[PDB]
Structure 1
Amino acid sequence: AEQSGISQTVIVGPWGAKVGKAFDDGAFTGIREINLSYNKETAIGDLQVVYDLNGSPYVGQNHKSFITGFTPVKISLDFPSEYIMEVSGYTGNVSGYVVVRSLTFKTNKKTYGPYGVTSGTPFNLPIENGLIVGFKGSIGYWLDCFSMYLSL
């Protein structure tokens, strides 16, 4: 804006640990589809998002755990009339680490989830005005932490 030539966005989070490999999808114009995986005994083990980028899909990088045995879930949104209004979940200890154990996504049409274990410390982000336009965080054995880009 007055410093560098890189546009800035509001970012909220992280929820989870403060430790595992960092990832950052950056900011887009909306969300078409979310793919994740979970294990009902542990935590979240995958995140991949199909973003909107100015009217067309942009397939985000797959952020995958090192370990196997997760159950995949696909959330296909009726884009653009359907959009996420609230994200909630739980953080908790697994094998000595604080990780994201559960996620739920509430849209204007449906509630998707909870996926994973609803045990530990809850968190929730309701949005009165604005949109989630991006994800970042960290994943090793499980999803350690995550933050969200918010925009008008």
Structure 2
Amino acid sequence: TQTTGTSQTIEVGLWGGPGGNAWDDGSYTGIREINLSHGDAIGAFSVIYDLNGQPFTGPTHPGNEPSFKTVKITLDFPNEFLVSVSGYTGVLARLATGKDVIRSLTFKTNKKTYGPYGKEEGTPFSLPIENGLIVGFKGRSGFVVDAIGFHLSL
């Protein structure tokens, strides 16, 4: 029985801490580009999704670590897609929060591996995908990415 007008997708996560503010890009039809920043953790994180064959700029999550290395991951959409996302969660001492944040991220597509970005220190996590696609990102962000999760769909 349908009780709401908003469609849904499987959602896994979040991995990371309770700090920062929650955000959810929602779901689309695929991923075209990922723009992030990294240093001793992951700072900025924004995505260019595919929306029915055309690019759609997702909401930005710039964080607040201007010193970080900026990176643009341009996927050969639609032939290239993520088959795994992994990383590390843990406290970043200098933040003085005592809460876990995303210290590192690695993106593996059917074509190549991007990363590891940030610092691989803390507790690892990984989401290998055998069938289906990540069609959206969600998480929490403050000065850095506190947590991350994914929307999945066939």
TM-score, normalised relative to structure 1 = 0.95
Deviations 1:49-100 (A, max 9, x none): 0000001000112101133211101100000000000001001111222100
Report the number of matched residues: 150
Distance (whole Å) between structure 2 residues aligned to residue 131 and residue 106 of structure 1: 13
Distance in structure 1 (CA, Å) of the matches to 2:28 and 2:110: 20
In 2, the alpha carbon distance for the partners of 1:125 and 1:8 equals 20
Percent identical among aligned pairs is 59
Kindly report which structure 2 residues correspond to 1:130-149, keeping only aligned pairs within 5 A, or say none: 130-149=132-151
Q: Distance in 2 between matches of 1:54 and 1:15?
A: 29
Aligned-pair CA distance for 1:9: 0.6
Matched with 1:111 is: 113
Q: Which runs of 4+ in 1 moved over 3 A?
A: none
Query: Larger deviation: 117-126 or 61-70?
Result: 61-70
Query: Partners of 2:127 and 2:21 in 1: how far apart?
Result: 24
Partner of 1:65: 63
| Alpha-carbon distance in structure 2 between the residues aligned to 1:34 and 1:66 | 18
Report the Cα distance in structure 2 between the residues aligned to 1:18 and 1:67, rounded to whole angstroms. Answer: 19
Q: What corresponds to 2:14 in structure 1?
A: 14
Matched residue SS, 1:64: coil
Partner of 1:49: 47
RMSD of aligned Cα (Å): 1.0
In structure 1, the partner of 2:124 is 122
Paired residues of 2:80 and 2:111 also in contact (CA < 8 A): yes
Which residues of 2 match residues 21-40 of structure 1 at below 5 A? Answer: 21-39=21-39
Normalised to the residue count of structure 2, the TM-score between the two structures is 0.94
